Design a protein around this ligand. Structure first.
Ligand code: CLA
Ligand code: CLA
Ligand code: CLA
Ligand code: CLA
Ligand code: CLA
Ligand code: CLA
Ligand SMILES: CCCCCCCCCCCCCCCC(=O)OC[C@H](CO[C@@H]1O[C@H](CS(=O)(=O)O)[C@@H](O)[C@H](O)[C@H]1O)OC(=O)CCCCCCCCCCCCCCC
Ligand SMILES: CC(=O)O[C@H]1CC(C)(C)C(=C=C/C(C)=C/C=C/C(C)=C/C=C/C=C(C)/C=C/C=C(\C)C(=O)C[C@@]23O[C@]2(C)C[C@@H](O)CC3(C)C)[C@](C)(O)C1
Ligand SMILES: CC(=O)O[C@H]1CC(C)(C)C(=C=C/C(C)=C/C=C/C(C)=C/C=C/C=C(C)/C=C/C=C(\C)C(=O)C[C@@]23O[C@]2(C)C[C@@H](O)CC3(C)C)[C@](C)(O)C1
Ligand SMILES: CC(=O)O[C@H]1CC(C)(C)C(=C=C/C(C)=C/C=C/C(C)=C/C=C/C=C(C)/C=C\C=C(/C)C(=O)C[C@@]23O[C@]2(C)C[C@@H](O)CC3(C)C)[C@](C)(O)C1
Ligand SMILES: CC(=O)O[C@H]1CC(C)(C)C(=C=C/C(C)=C/C=C/C(C)=C/C=C/C=C(C)/C=C\C=C(/C)C(=O)C[C@@]23O[C@]2(C)C[C@@H](O)CC3(C)C)[C@](C)(O)C1
Lengths: 172, 144, 183
């Protein structure tokens, strides 16, 4: 009876689409209050940031560092890099460029909501991977991102918490 | 209802008081019960022990479980009679002439009323005087 | 019926039905006839089931720890009352205890949502969550099992309360306390 696959004991939430990653998992029904596309964009953004963050945090701790290191930037762990970057100015540089990108993203999201036709999270850069492939595979790739993205959020959260809770080597 | 309840409770109490006076203690009981000097002194020691509290909770459960019937009767939705809890395990009065059931119930009432009055002396006399089979008070001596 | 099996001196609970699992016609205060502040028989039914299930697991777990000792990785808790033991581990590895609570909160919230909506829609039945739903068969078995669930659940509830209260005072293990009384 239109039951969510994820929750076999609960009616599948309406207002949801049939897009990739739609397993009917919206117990609190956030979709009722906020357009789905906006939500999809958010999920991707959060996850894509987390995926990248995990890699960086781990690598820095493992030892991979820019060779011409800046002042300090040595004997510093991922847990302690933020402040160092701030004073060095690296964080400022990143914030500036990231914020600029977010501005253009704002324009993008608005157009998407107005009906431009932009798929949530699609900015056009595919490296040619999606070039030539049919919807079947296109959707498959999208689903794979989504799965990785959701998993990544759990991963990053754990690494950070554990690390601070138990100062130590990469495997905490 | 109150008369019956009071009577039943009184009869029960009288028996217990004497049995305890005779020394009867729970089968498998321990020092707390054995040490008790006299029924007149049991209440305080037991409340201190906490067992009295336990009894209260149990008794309360019984009260609530059985009292609701009165409301039903007042509502006029039931025709139960006073004191009728349909309790006759040994069937003493099962299949008995109504007249006989009447004499039986009267017998209960009579014994109950007697017990209620009985408990009074079993309490006041003991408090003023001493506990014994007669539970008398030293006339010449002080009582309180 | 004009009478109840448990209480043969008062009329039977109207809403209560012998068909319902665990029916014995025992509702002296007529709590079944409640439909306010979001509470109804459906809620009551679900509540009894949850209490029973939780209580059953609790008694088993406490007994297991006392009888077969703490699990691998958990050796800080040596108390046999299963009350200080909790505190022992809470002072050793509070993370696992707290973490479990976090997951429970989320699960419980979804459960509440399902109960609310399910009750209104009528699609769900009190106690159903899907687990081992296929286990029973013929439905008669389901009913029997059901009744049993409540049967041991009610018993477990009393037992569970005893352990939590007793241990909070005797400062000794439940099994050993039983032994003392029997010794
Ligand atoms: C969530 C994103 C994120 C954030 C906020 C940071 C933040 C930080 N990183 Mg870090 N890093 C990240 C991801 C991130 N990293 C990833 C994914 C890698 C893997 C290469 C690294 C590898 C890395 C190294 C090796 C070092 C840092 C360092 C630092 C600190 C100083 C900044 C710096 O030197 O950057 C440098 C960051 C890089 C060189 C990463 C390069 C990643 C490639 C070049 C970009 C790939 C683009 C991709 C193909 C397409 C996306 C394009 C567009 C969307 C942008 C700062 C705390 C330094 C530090 O703390 O030293 C103590 C340092 O030595 N990071
Ligand atoms: C991929 C996800 C993932 C994995 C593999 C682990 C794996 C582990 N976690 Mg972890 N954790 C995660 C997500 C994850 N966690 C998340 C999302 C949080 C929320 C903050 C935590 C919070 C957490 C705490 C608080 C602790 C662990 C601990 C542990 C270790 C036991 C083990 C290595 C424990 C540990 O070993 O501490 C270092 C521990 O104390 N984790
Ligand atoms: C109705 C009264 C009554 C009767 C007939 C028995 C009967 C029995 N008790 Mg007992 N007992 C009672 C009340 C009673 N008990 C009370 C009120 C207490 C509270 C102290 C106890 C505490 C008690 C202990 C601690 C023990 C018994 C034991 C026994 C034995 C025998 C079957 C012994 C036994 O092995 O029980 C089977 C035993 O060790 N009883
Ligand atoms: C219930 C109220 C009550 C009270 C306050 C007393 C109080 C007293 N009784 Mg008493 N008594 C009672 C009921 C009561 N009794 C009952 C129901 C009987 C059954 C017959 C007796 C039989 C009785 C006898 C036989 C004696 C007392 C005596 C006494 C006094 C010692 C004492 C003042 C003694 C007395 O005469 O002292 C005044 C005494 O010898 N009582
Ligand atoms: C009411 C249920 C209940 C509760 C509150 C506890 C509580 C506790 N147990 Mg315990 N236990 C239980 C049942 C329960 N147990 C049962 C049923 C058994 C098997 C018979 C055990 C066996 C057991 C052992 C062997 C040990 C404990 C330990 C502990 C303590 C450490 C906390 C802990 O496990 O870390 C949090 C980690 C977990 C809870 C991991 C278990 C997670 C399970 C697999 C999933 C939860 C079940 C799920 C929610 C049910 C779904 C129902 C619903 C969603 C449909 C803690 C006081 C440890 C201890 O310190 O001893 C004092 C210990 O060594 N327990
Ligand atoms: C569900 C039952 C269960 C089972 C089968 C195990 C089994 C195991 N646990 Mg364990 N554990 C349990 C419940 C359980 N635990 C609970 C409820 C907690 C909550 C605190 C823990 C916390 C815990 C820690 C903190 C550690 C273990 C560890 C271990 C492993 C080795 C223990 C040892 O002697 O170190 C050798 C072993 C496979 C140790 C390990 O390395 O494995 C994870 C370890 O360090 N456990
Ligand atoms: C200071 C006051 C703050 C109040 C906070 C308000 C938060 C309410 C959130 C949940 C309210 C009910 C939502 C469930 C479905 C629903 O809308 O019921 C519909 C409402 C709320 O019911 C109600 O019933 C839900 C209660 S209960 O589930 O039966 O516990 O009832 C209409 O008859
Ligand atoms: C220390 C410890 O642990 O234990 C302690 C516990 C605790 C609680 C502290 C104690 C206590 C206090 C207690 C128990 C107090 C209880 C007191 C109680 C029970 C008091 C009833 C009086 C009844 C009367 C007066 C009836 C008169 C009846 C009269 C006057 C009549 O005319 C009857 C009669 O008219 C009829 C109706 C009809 C006529 O045809 C016949 C006659 C004319 C004769 C104790 C005792 O200290 C023990
Ligand atoms: C049908 C079926 O299933 O079977 C039965 C089985 C079963 C369970 C047994 C049932 C029962 C019946 C029961 C339990 C009956 C119990 C009856 C009981 C226990 C009845 C006590 C009376 C006490 C009296 C009269 C006291 C007089 C006391 C008197 C007269 C005194 O004055 C004594 C005195 O000391 C005072 C107080 C003061 C002193 O100064 C003076 C003296 C010395 C004189 C059921 C429920 O019915 C069902
Ligand atoms: C130390 C030792 O060894 O012994 C210990 C044993 C033990 C057990 C550890 C101890 C304890 C006792 C405790 C505190 C145990 C914890 C117990 C607790 C407190 C368990 C409740 C959660 C309830 C919440 C969050 C309330 C509302 C949650 C509500 C109201 C909801 O929103 C649900 C909701 O459904 C509504 C109503 C409407 C729905 O439409 C929407 C949803 C679904 C969201 C002691 C005292 O320490 C002694
Ligand atoms: C895919 C999947 O998973 O489907 C699932 C579906 C589902 C339904 C979950 C399944 C199930 C069935 C389950 C989990 C059943 C669990 C049943 C359970 C756990 C049932 C009773 C416990 C009762 C006790 C312990 C009673 C009394 C405890 C008593 C009476 C005590 O006296 C304890 C005691 O403490 C006192 C009070 C005094 C103390 O001084 C001393 C002692 C120790 C003596 C399946 C079929 O497995 C698979």
């Amino acid at each position: 009876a239109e039951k969510s696959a994820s929750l076999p004991f609960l009616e599948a939430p309406p207002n949801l689409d049939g897009g990739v990653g739609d397993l009917g998992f919206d117990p609190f029904r956030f979709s009722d209050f906020v357009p789905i596309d906006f939500l999809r964009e958010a999920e991707l953004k959060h996850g894509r940031i987390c995926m990248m963050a995990w890699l960086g945090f781990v690598a820095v701790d493992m030892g991979f560092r820019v060779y011409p290191a800046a002042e300090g930037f040595e004997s510093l762990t991922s847990i302690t890099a933020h402040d160092a970057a701030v004073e060095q100015g690296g964080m400022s540089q990143m914030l500036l460029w990231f914020s600029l990108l977010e501005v253009f993203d704002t324009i993008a999201v608005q157009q998407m909501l107005e009906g431009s036709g932009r798929a949530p999270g699609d900015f056009g850069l595919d490296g040619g991977f999606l070039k030539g492939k049919s919807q079947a595979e296109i959707d498959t790739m999208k689903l794979k991102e989504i799965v990785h993205c959701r998993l990544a959020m759990f991963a990053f959260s754990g690494v950070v918490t554990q690390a601070v809770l138990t100062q130590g080597p990469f495997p905490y | 209802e109150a008369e019956l309840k009071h009577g039943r409770i009184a009869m029960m109490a009288f028996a217990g008081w004497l049995a305890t006076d005779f020394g009867v203690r729970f089968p498998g009981a321990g020092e707390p019960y054995t040490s008790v000097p006299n029924a007149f002194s049991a209440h305080n020691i037991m409340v201190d022990s906490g067992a009295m509290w336990v009894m209260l909770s149990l008794i309360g459960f019984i009260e609530i479980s059985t009292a609701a019937v009165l409301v039903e009767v007042s509502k006029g939705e039931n025709d139960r009679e006073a004191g009728d809890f349909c309790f006759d395990p040994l069937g003493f009065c099962k299949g008995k002439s109504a007249d006989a059931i009447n004499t039986m119930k009267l017998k209960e009432l009579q014994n109950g009323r007697a017990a209620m009055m009985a408990f009074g002396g079993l309490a006041t006399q003991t408090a003023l005087g001493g506990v014994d089979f007669p539970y008398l008070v030293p006339y010449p001596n002080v009582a309180d | 019926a004009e009478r109840s099996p448990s209480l043969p001196f008062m009329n039977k609970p109207a809403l209560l039905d012998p068909s319902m699992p665990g029916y014995k016609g025992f509702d002296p205060l007529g709590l079944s006839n409640i439909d306010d502040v979001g509470i109804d028989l459906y809620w009551l039914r679900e509540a009894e089931i949850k209490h029973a299930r939780v209580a059953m697991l609790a008694v088993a777990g406490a007994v297991w720890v006392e009888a077969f000792g703490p699990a691998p990785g958990c050796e800080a808790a040596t108390a046999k009352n299963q009350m200080d033991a909790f505190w022992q581990i809470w002072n050793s590895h509070p993370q696992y205890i707290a973490a479990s609570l976090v997951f429970i909160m989320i699960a419980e919230a979804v459960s509440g949502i399902s109960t609310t909506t399910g009750r209104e829609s009528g699609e769900r039945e009190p106690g159903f969550f899907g687990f081992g739903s296929n286990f029973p068969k013929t439905d008669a078995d389901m009913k029997k099992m059901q009744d049993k669930e409540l049967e041991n659940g009610r018993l477990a509830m009393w037992a569970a309360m005893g352990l939590i209260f007793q241990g909070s005072a005797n400062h000794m293990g439940g099994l050993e306390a039983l032994g003392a009384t029997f010794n």
